[PDB]
Design a protein around this ligand. Structure first.
Ligand SMILES: CC[C@H](O)[C@@H](C)[C@H]1O[C@@H]1C[C@@](C)(O)/C=C/C=C(\C)[C@H]1OC(=O)C[C@H](O)CC[C@@](C)(O)[C@@H](OC(=O)N2CCN(C3CCCCCC3)CC2)/C=C/[C@@H]1C
Ligand SMILES: [Zn+2]
Ligand SMILES: [Zn+2]
Ligand SMILES: [Zn+2]
Lengths: 441, 106, 209, 85, 815, 66
RNA sequence: GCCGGCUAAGAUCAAGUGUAGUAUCUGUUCUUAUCAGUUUAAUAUCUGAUUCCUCGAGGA
């Protein structure tokens, strides 16, 4: 018995999503990752339709996806870290409509491994360095440069290994053309493996570690490391340089913290809760994704909780110091895996399951009566807000997605001659039964 | 401070895999449990012997090599090639767990 | 009609017979691999198609020696089943079904994935088609490697080595190469690119759309 | 004292001499060279810039891993330069 | 005690003449020791040893690393000595050795990071105003290194202050030189600070001092070269002064300003690039007539830079630039001038790459006939470069006639054998192609005259020309005096010079390889017996060409010589598989394949088995390679029965040879072996049951090569069967046997899968005996390092005890 | 020996089991459709399942013996 | 190997020969015995202690 495999309908679930000027023009495109498929989309700013331009099977597991641009360039590159032991850099060719591999750097064995990098991927905001990281001790840094023909050159990796260490998230820090910095949420488990009482397992804190790359001396050094109050999930790069301070936002359980090295104190804001909530009171609240929108006048963030509530985060600043964090309820959409805020005023929502959405950001600024929470407000006790239907967003497009398919039956339950596909898919209150027919509508 | 064979046979779900030396292991309960996994062929059985894995008996003196039937039935053209690929049969093969040892030929 | 097939959460497949007059359920065959079975489909009286939590599809068949009338050798059953097919899909399959999709077409094995994908596995009927597609896959594995640095043969052998499956998603990437490499590939198969394209389209339109 | 370097390999290409030209660095096979050899930065510096990775004479051509070593992913360890202590 | 620390810091000799382990040990310990030793003694002793007149390269590298590490720790205690260190290491930055410069720059960088910016500035400022020009250069290079280490904005205020100094022009000159050296050293990393540097240095272009203007123009050129192809808004306040200066200046300053213009033009748009080119072009045309040669080089560079942009179009170029260029630069005075000769060739080629090949090619092709041969070689070089880069499409009848006549006259008028005329002739004929039909009689007459006599250095060049042009020689449908040439090449087969014999054989091979064996004049049954004694020559080129020729003959003209002579030739070729050179081995493999394909596998295989039985080691290894070659060319179906029949001989050292041959056969055929695993399985069984150790070692090697050869082809049954016989050998003490067993196990890990290997290791992982545990954990670690991810799905279930939880519950979920 | 997860003749049950638990959690974090399966099974967001696995990474199988 | 045994089933300590490497040969001895410790999967090994009979002697 010999078999031939064919795909009839590709996967439609999204894992990661990045946006940028990948064709070199002024319009913006989105690159989404399926499990093993890479795909370029372009939303039309005239009608709000999302068109698929290119889709390629990569025959691997994509684990991290970033975009970066060199100083003076007008085109964005794509950095991919996968389950191979290689880092790859790609370039979209609009005239050929294909992805051209620019660089390949091999550093380890293939597979989703504990200590081989490929799970975490960070890039310097100016585009001169990229860091690839595993969940365990191994971290590598590549320097990115350019020759006189304006082609991209890559250097040999620099090692930043540290035994008995777990990594939760890595982001690049925005400095003003100073030495590149990377921030990491780290945990040391050496003491917990030697205590049979089980007390070293507890009493163990996350640290926020800063790694500085010295381009003059060509090595990576640990500069700062501070223990945190509680364990946090992902980090957020704050825009620095000449537009904004240069720190990080730590998203945690029930809190969001701003942190910077130097003389800057820590600023904490508790996450507001829905008034008259019906969920179990023992459960906490975390953020699940974020989206930054930088403007030549100001910047803000968009973070979403597990309930699907997007809050608008702004930062009250001084000449250099940050003084307050302000949170304001923005809207409620399905729980997303990624969010992209596009110039020309569009928000793209790629859900964890089910259909994806493109929204028009209808109301800029905030002229409203609803309360704005702050870190300066005193509370012994938490903030409360009331969820309401959409006010700041308008639904423009909806992309179908069969993920997750849970049960299928192929049968002729109507009295056509061709069989139909009856598919029980979806999870939670967004599940549905879908009938698929071969044809056009 | 070490089990006896009969005492360890009372604790395990499968006592017939317990052996003489099994009570002398650093963790006999894990050893006996792995000896009962629904796979996992055992050790080559001559680790405790003292004859370097080649028994000097059983009369190993025998014919050098008996070629297959397909061997017997220019030297031969594409027609005898057709013959060699029409006569080709699959030989006797042992399955996953059938280890060889010095005695099991006669 | 006669036999019962049981899926274990961690073991793969158990064959059972129901003795109608003795009122007995007897195990007469099992497998030699641990499999985290998600779903199973009967292909005929002796063969079973299975899926896995880790993204694999396999086909298991009873040897012709198999005796049904029973009243362990590996701490298992006395008779074993052979694995005749192994394939890594890359996504978790939860549905398998043998059916005919187009009116007047041929039967295929349709599977369904947790990421929303739909695919088929179709049998070859002649040795010439199998050999041609095998050579196409061999030559496309080298001259059109995966984009993110993965080895194609190593990816389809993620948990078990591939056995008797041709990746038609790698083969249809021939139609999207550049004409120079399309000619370099086609002139080794003793053929032109349009003939290769027509041969690729024929097997697809024979079964699916 | 025939020990591999096994340091993080960089962008430098390994070289072979006239005597070792067709050889694989790891298994010493001559059949089917498949993957270009990379060496670390301390093996490629100053007087060490062009040198056979097997012996250390003047390099003339590229060093390669064989298809057999590439299948087993033995090209994924560190620098394969033979170093003596 | 003082010399206490000295006697103990002889650690640096512990490192200098020491072993690598104690090297790194003393490195770490002296790093821990540095802060307490103190910088005084440490430097007082190390700087002499770094000043040692005959130190080595890698000793210097290790010393620099020691400096780096002892400088990182002791940070602010190095200040009172900085000056001293600099006077030792401010040289090594203008050294003609590249790595000396890298080491000096690294040392100065680590010194600047250890100390502060204020200290470096305070020690380096007194030598800013020095009169010795040798000091002002090292000072500028060291300031550039400090700027690269501590950053540009940290030095920007000192720069802005120093090149506004009204005290002396030397300080301004040195500041602008610092900016220039910063550009030269950092490259495209200056782009965020480009405008700052430009506004810092821009006021020097209008200074009252002429040396300040020149250095400012050179700094502008350096910045523009570092910035390309980005940055034109930052060069805006310089466009007016630079062009007014090229309009008013004359001499060295004019050359600097023109270099600046030329490096700035490729950054503009079409308008500005087109508008600016006109101005600098009238100035450059005026400057064509200059006697100075530096000026000529700068003018050529600027012409090449500007004529390569889009704002300048071919019309303006051919109308205004070409007449004066070709009137002023193309004279043999340029040819004897070795300095600007290559520059002129490159400028002319890059001009033709935009304006079109025809005009350039004509204007210089009339000059191919000349009294001076230097001017001839120059024109030939330029012509063949243009021909290789663009071709001969728009070359027409008149130009074709002139080209052919010129290259023919240049070929004959040749004093010393040069590669220039050879390559020119070759590429011209190859670009013309099927168009040169009558100049084919002409060229054949020319090469016949050159090949007839004159010292064989002309004959070997003629043979090279034949070898490189025979393709177009025959593809024009002409074969007769082709045979006339082949006859003469045949007569030139006894030559005392091996270099000429190599070219003769190459020409003969190129002939017989391109003309058909059909209807060709020199008979093969005459060439081959004359050719077989040359195979024993010991020159590499002669050997390679002879083997290639015999291979071509065996591939195409196999039916013209008896099989007995083929057998003798193959048995003689057997010894060439040991050649120290790779091309000899490659050609020998090819030719052996051809001869085997020709005469048939049966007789050669019988002879190879007989030869494998009776000879020494190296010859038996070569015989094994030959058997594998025969089995690959003629399908292994033809070799395997006769080879397996030889294992039936009841005698050791014969079966071991069969096993080595099978090992190399499977390793060599790879994927082709999928049809032959069932045939060799009982033989491998027999060999694995044998008491002889070499039997089992070689059978394990065969298993490994067979496993890695078939992978993804569904041969798991036989491989599991063979693993059942390989596995009992894990308790073997002999090192070679256990090495082969480990190799076979790692091959089966790929071909059979890690699940089976884990199933074989599980019961021994925790055995009571330490020997079993050692062996099984070695095998398990080998299985774990490769395919760590797959093992996740294969681990067996382990139940919870009272203290610890071991069940993986997530995998028990059921949707 | 330099690779994390390898063993030797003195390896205990606890070290073996925590090693396989730790690389199981890393494999779950890596493979996109296994995390989907778990997040559908226990009705949680995928970010929450990822954070729970990272938190379980520290002390899987409880604290060691004696 | 022959019809349980005939001491070709093992270890060891000195010397010779020789190889790139494995090795090959001679003298030997083999506790015939007990206890304690080390150690070995268990042996092993090592570390210490421990008048009577017969015909000037031998054995225990
Ligand atoms: C046990 C064998 C010995 O170790 C022997 C190879 C070698 O140790 C001796 C020493 C010495 C100097 O006498 C010989 C060394 C090596 C050779 C004779 C090899 O040839 C060379 O060096 C020349 C050069 O490296 C390339 C030769 C080449 C291409 O034939 C090479 O083999 C190949 O690459 N193959 C053989 C396999 N063949 C098939 C065809 C389908 C697709 C490609 C792969 C499979 C492709 C071409 C090896 C040949 C000689 C063993
Ligand atoms: Zn190799
Ligand atoms: Zn060498
Ligand atoms: Zn190295």
């Amino acid at each position: 018995m010999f078999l031939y495999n064919l795909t009839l309908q590709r996967a439609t679930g999204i894992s990661f999503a990045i946006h940028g000027n990948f064709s070199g023009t002024k319009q913006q495109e989105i690159v989404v990752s399926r499990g093993k498929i890479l795909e370029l989309l372009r939303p039309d700013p005239n009608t709000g339709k999302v068109h698929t331009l290119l889709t390629v099977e990569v025959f691997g597991v994509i684990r991290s996806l970033m975009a970066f641009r060199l100083t003076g360039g007008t085109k964005d590159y794509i950095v991919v870290g996968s389950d191979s032991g290689r880092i790859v850099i790609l370039e979209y060719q609009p005239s050929k409509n294909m992805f051209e591999k620019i660089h390949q750097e091999t550093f380890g064995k293939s597979g989703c491994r504990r200590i081989v990098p490929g799970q975490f991927l960070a890039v310097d905001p100016k585009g001169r360095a990229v860091m690839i990281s595993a969940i365990e001790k191994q971290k590598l840094v590549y320097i990115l440069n350019r020759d006189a023909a304006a082609r991209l050159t890559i250097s040999s990796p620099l090692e930043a290994h540290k035994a008995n260490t777990l990594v939760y998230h890595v982001v690049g820090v925005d400095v003003g053309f100073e030495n590149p910095m990377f921030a990491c949420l780290e945990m040391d488990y050496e003491e917990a493996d030697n205590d049979p009482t089980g007390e070293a397992a507890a009493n163990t804190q996350q640290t926020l570690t800063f790694y500085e790359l010295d381009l003059g001396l060509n090595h990576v050094v640990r500069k700062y490391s501070e223990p945190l109050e509680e364990h946090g999930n992902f980090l957020i790069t704050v825009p620095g340089g000449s537009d904004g301070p240069s720190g990080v936002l730590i998203c945690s359980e029930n809190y969001i913290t701003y942190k910077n090295f130097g003389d800057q104190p820590d600023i904490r804001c508790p996450i507001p809760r829905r008034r008259n909530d019906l969920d179990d009171p023992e459960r906490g609240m975390i953020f699940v994704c974020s989206a930054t929108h930088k403007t030549k006048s100001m910047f803000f963030f968009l973070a979403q909780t597990e309930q699907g509530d997007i809050f608008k985060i702004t930062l009250e600043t001084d000449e250099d110091m940050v003084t307050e964090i302000r949170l304001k309820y923005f809207d409620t959409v399905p729980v997303a895996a990624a969010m992209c805020v596009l110039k020309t005023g569009f928000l793209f929502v790629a859900s964890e399951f089910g259909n994806h959405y493109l929204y028009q950001i209808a109301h800029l600024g905030d002229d409203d009566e609803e309360p704005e929470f702050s870190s300066a407000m005193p509370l012994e006790d938490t903030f409360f807000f009331q969820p309401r239907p959409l006010k700041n967003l308008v639904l423009v497009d909806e992309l179908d997605s069969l993920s997750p398919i849970l049960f299928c039956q192929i049968a002729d339950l109507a009295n056509e001659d061709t069989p139909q596909l009856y598919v029980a898919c979806g999870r939670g209150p967004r599940s549905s039964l879908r009938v698929l027919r071969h044809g056009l509508e | 401070n070490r089990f006896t064979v009969a005492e360890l046979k009372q604790l395990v779900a499968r006592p017939d895999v317990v052996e003489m030396h099994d009570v002398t292991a650093q963790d006999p309960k894990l050893l006996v449990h792995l000896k009962a996994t629904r796979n996992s062929v055992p050790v080559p059985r001559h680790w405790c012997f003292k004859r370097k894995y080649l028994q000097g008996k059983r009369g190993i003196e025998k014919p050098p090599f008996e070629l297959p039937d397909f061997i017997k039935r220019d030297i031969d053209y594409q027609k005898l090639h057709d013959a060699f690929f029409k006569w080709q049969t699959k030989p006797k093969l042992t399955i996953h767990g059938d280890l060889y040892y010095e005695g099991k030929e006669f | 009609g006669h036999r019962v097939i049981v899926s274990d959460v961690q073991e793969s497949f158990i064959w059972v017979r129901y003795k109608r007059n003795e009122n007995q359920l007897i195990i007469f065959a099992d497998d030699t691999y641990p499999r985290w079975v998600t779903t199973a489909s009967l292909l005929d009286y002796d063969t079973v198609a299975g899926a896995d939590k880790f993204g694999n599809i396999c086909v298991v068949r009873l040897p012709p020696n198999t005796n049904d009338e029973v009243d362990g050798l590996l701490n298992g059953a006395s008779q074993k089943a052979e694995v005749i097919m192994n394939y890594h899909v890359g996504e978790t399959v939860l549905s398998l079904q043998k059916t005919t999709l187009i009116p007047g077409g041929s039967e295929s094995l349709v599977y369904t994935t947790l990421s929303g994908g739909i695919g088929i596995l179709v049998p070859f009927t002649s040795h010439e088609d199998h050999d041609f597609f095998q050579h196409v896959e061999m030559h496309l594995r080298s001259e059109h490697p995966p984009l993110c640095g993965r080895d194609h043969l190593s990816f389809r052998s993620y948990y078990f080595p591939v056995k008797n499956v041709i990746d038609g998603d790698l083969c249809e990437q021939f139609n999207s190469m550049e004409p120079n490499k399309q000619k370099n590939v086609s002139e080794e198969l003793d053929r032109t690119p349009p003939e290769v394209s027509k041969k690729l389209e024929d097997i697809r339109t024979r079964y699916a759309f | 004292d025939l020990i591999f370097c096994r340091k993080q390999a960089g962008v430098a290409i390994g070289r072979l001499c006239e005597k070792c030209d067709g050889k694989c660095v790891i298994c010493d096979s001559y059949v089917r060279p498949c993957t270009l050899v990379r060496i670390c930065d301390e093996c490629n510096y100053g007087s060490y810039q062009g040198r056979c990775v097997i012996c250390g004479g003047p390099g003339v051509s590229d060093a390669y891993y064989c298809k057999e070593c590439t299948i087993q992913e033995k090209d994924r360890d560190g620098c394969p330069k033979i170093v003596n202590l | 005690e003082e010399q206490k620390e000295r006697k103990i810091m002889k650690l640096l000799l512990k490192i200098k003449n020491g072993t690598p382990p104690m090297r790194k040990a003393a490195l770490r310990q002296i790093t821990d020791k540095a802060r307490e030793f103190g910088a005084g003694p440490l430097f007082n002793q190390i700087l002499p040893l770094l000043m040692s007149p005959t130190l080595e390269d890698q000793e210097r590298h290790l010393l620099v690393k020691v400096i780096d590490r002892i400088l990182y720790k002791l940070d602010d205690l190095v200040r009172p000595y900085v000056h001293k260190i600099l006077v030792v290491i401010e040289p090594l930055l203008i050294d003609e050795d590249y790595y000396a410069r890298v080491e000096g720059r690294e040392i100065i960088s680590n010194l600047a990071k250890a100390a502060g910016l204020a200290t470096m500035i305070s020690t380096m400022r007194p030598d800013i105003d020095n009169m010795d020009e040798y000091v002002r250069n090292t000072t500028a290079r060291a300031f550039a290194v400090v700027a690269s280490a501590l950053g540009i904005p940290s030095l920007l205020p000192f720069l802005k202050a120093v090149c506004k100094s009204k005290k002396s022009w030397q300080a301004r000159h040195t500041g602008i030189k610092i900016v220039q050296q910063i550009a030269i050293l950092m490259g495209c990393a200056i782009l965020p600070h480009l405008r700052s540097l430009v506004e810092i240095i821009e006021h020097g272009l209008v200074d009252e001092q002429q040396k300040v203007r020149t250095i400012s123009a050179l700094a502008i050129a350096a910045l523009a070269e570092a910035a390309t192809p980005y940055g034109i808004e930052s060069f805006d306040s310089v466009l007016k002064p630079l062009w007014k200066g090229i309009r008013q200046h004359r001499g060295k300053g004019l050359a600097a300003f023109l270099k600046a213009i030329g490096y700035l033009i490729p950054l503009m748009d079409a308008e500005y690039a087109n508008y600016y080119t006109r101005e600098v072009m009238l100035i450059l045309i005026r400057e064509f007539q200059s006697p100075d040669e530096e000026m000529k080089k700068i003018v050529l560079k600027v012409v090449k830079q500007c004529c390569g942009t889009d704002g300048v179009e071919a019309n303006y170029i051919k109308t205004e630039i070409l007449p004066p260029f070709f009137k002023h630069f193309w004279q043999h005075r340029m040819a004897l001038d070795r300095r600007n000769y290559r520059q002129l060739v490159d400028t002319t080629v890059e001009l033709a790459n935009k304006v079109g090949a025809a005009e350039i090619i004509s204007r210089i092709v009339d000059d191919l006939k000349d009294e001076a041969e230097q001017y001839r070689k120059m024109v030939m070089e330029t012509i063949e470069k243009i021909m290789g880069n663009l071709g001969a499409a728009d070359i027409d009848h008149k130009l074709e006639e002139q080209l052919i006549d010129g290259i023919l006259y240049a070929f004959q008028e040749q004093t010393t054998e040069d590669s220039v005329m050879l390559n020119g002739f070759g590429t011209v004929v190859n670009a013309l192609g099927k168009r040169v039909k009558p100049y084919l009689p002409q060229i054949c007459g020319t090469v016949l005259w050159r090949l007839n006599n004159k010292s064989a250095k002309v004959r070997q060049q003629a043979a090279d020309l034949i070898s490189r042009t025979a393709v177009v020689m025959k593809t024009c449908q002409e074969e007769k005096l082709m045979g006339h040439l082949g006859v003469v090449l045949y007569e030139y087969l006894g030559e005392e010079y091996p270099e000429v014999l190599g070219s003769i054989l190459g020409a003969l091979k190129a002939i017989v390889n391109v003309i058909g064996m059909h209807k060709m004049t020199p008979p093969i049954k005459d060439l081959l017996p004359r050719l077989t004694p040359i195979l024993k020559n010991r020159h590499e080129k002669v050997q390679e060409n002879c083997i290639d020729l015999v291979g071509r003959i065996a591939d195409r003209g196999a039916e013209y010589v008896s099989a007995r002579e083929w057998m003798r030739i193959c048995f003689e070729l057997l010894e060439l598989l040991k050649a120290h050179k790779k091309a000899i081995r490659r050609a020998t493999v090819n030719t052996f394949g051809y001869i085997a394909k020709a005469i048939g596998p049966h007789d050669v295989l019988a002879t190879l088995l007989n030869n494998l039985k009776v000879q020494e080691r190296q010859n038996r290894v070569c015989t094994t390679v030959a058997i594998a070659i025969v089995a690959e060319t003629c399908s292994p179906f033809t070799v395997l029965p006769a080879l397996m029949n030889e294992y039936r001989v009841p005698e050791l050292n014969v079966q071991n040879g069969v096993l080595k041959s099978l090992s190399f056969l499977f390793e060599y055929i790879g994927e082709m072996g999928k049809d032959y695993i069932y045939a060799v399985t009982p033989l491998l069984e027999d060999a694995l049951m044998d008491r002889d150790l070499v039997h089992r070692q070689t059978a394990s090697a065969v298993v490994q090569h067979m496993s890695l050869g078939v992978y993804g082809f569904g041969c798991e049954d036989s491989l599991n069967h063979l693993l059942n016989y390989v596995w009992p050998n894990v308790f073997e003490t002999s090192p070679h046997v256990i090495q082969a067993v480990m190799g076979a196990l790692e091959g089966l890990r790929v071909a059979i899968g890690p699940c089976r290997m884990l199933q074989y290791c599980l019961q021994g992982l925790f055995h009571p005996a330490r020997k079993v545990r050692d062996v099984y954990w070695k095998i398990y670690n080998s299985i774990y390092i490769g395919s760590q991810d797959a093992l996740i799905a294969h681990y067996p279930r382990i139940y919870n005890d009272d203290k610890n939880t071991y069940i993986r519950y997530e995998l028990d979920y059921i949707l | 020996s330099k690779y994390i997860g390898t063993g030797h003749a003195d390896t205990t049950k606890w070290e073996w089991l925590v090693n396989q638990h730790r690389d199981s959690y890393c494999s779950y974090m890596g493979h996109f459709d296994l995390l989907n399966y778990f997040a559908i099974a226990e009705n949680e967001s995928k970010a929450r399942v990822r954070f729970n696995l990272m938190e379980k990474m520290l002390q899987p199988c409880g604290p060691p013996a004696d």
